[PDB]
Each structure stands twice: as structure tokens, then as C-alpha cells.
């Protein structure tokens, strides 16, 4: 139906602004180490700890697949980056430090897309 592709057309547009949400965060991480999955073979007891493990290569994955239907979705798994990184190590550690920059500094960032998610529909 013309409905079904206009639903597709605001899902594809929302994908788009979601990818330069997802890169301007991902700047905010120049170490890189959000970049990719915590390694089972490196920390085999991290399932343990984390239930739900998340990383910002397994966001692309599913932003690319337009997996994410709104933007709460979305901050939902960047917010499990840092809360995960923030359980798991300790205080005084460069990854617990370097999550608690990204949570700032993505806060600015995501409070315009909220604005423009709004606006723009």
C-alpha cells in the first residue's frame, strides 16, 4: 500500500539522522573503546557480570538493518554501553572514566535529535 511506504519513507529518514547521531557520539569515544563487542576469549566471565553486552559496531549493525523504529530505542542501547562499562569496571579505570565523557558529551548531541526526531516527525 501507498500507507506501508510512506511508513517505510519516515523509517529510512529516521535511519539517516540516526547515522549522524551514531557518528557524532562515536567521535566522542577517539580512544575506541566502545568500538567494538567486550571479547569472550579476552574477559570469558563477562556474561556473567553483563547480561545484555553492547557495543557501537552492534548498534551499526542493527541501525543499518533499520532495526531501530524511534529514538528512545536507539538510546536505549547507547545508554547500555556506558551503564554496562560503568558496572564492570571500577571507578578509577581509563574505561570508566572514558564512559562517563561519552555520556556527557552524547548528552548535547542527543538532546537535538530529540528536538529534530519531534520536529521534523
Known amino acids: 500500500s501507498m500507507e506501508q511506504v510512506a511508513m517505510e519513507l519516515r523509517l529510512t529518514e529516521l535511519t539517516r539522522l540516526l ?8 567521535d566522542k569515544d577517539p580512544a575506541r573503546i566502545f568500538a567494538q563487542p567486550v571479547s569472550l576469549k579476552e574477559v570469558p566471565d ?3 557480570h553483563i547480561k545484555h553486552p553492547m557495543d557501537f559496531a552492534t548498534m551499526r549493525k542493527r541501525l543499518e538493518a533499520q532495526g531501530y523504529k524511534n529514538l528512545h530505542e536507539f538510546e536505549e ?3 547500555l554501553i556506558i551503564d554496562n562499562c560503568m558496572k564492570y569496571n571500577a571507578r578509577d579505570t581509563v574505561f570508566y572514566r572514558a564512559a562517563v565523557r561519552l555520556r556527557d558529551q552524547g548528552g ?8 529534530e526526531v519531534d520536529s521534523i516527525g
Open 77 to 79: 542501547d547507547f545508554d
Open 108 to 115: 548535547v548531541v542527543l538532546r537535538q535529535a530529540r528536538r
Open 19 to 26: 547515522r549522524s547521531v551514531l557518528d557524532q557520539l562515536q
Open 46 to 48: 563477562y556474561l556473567d
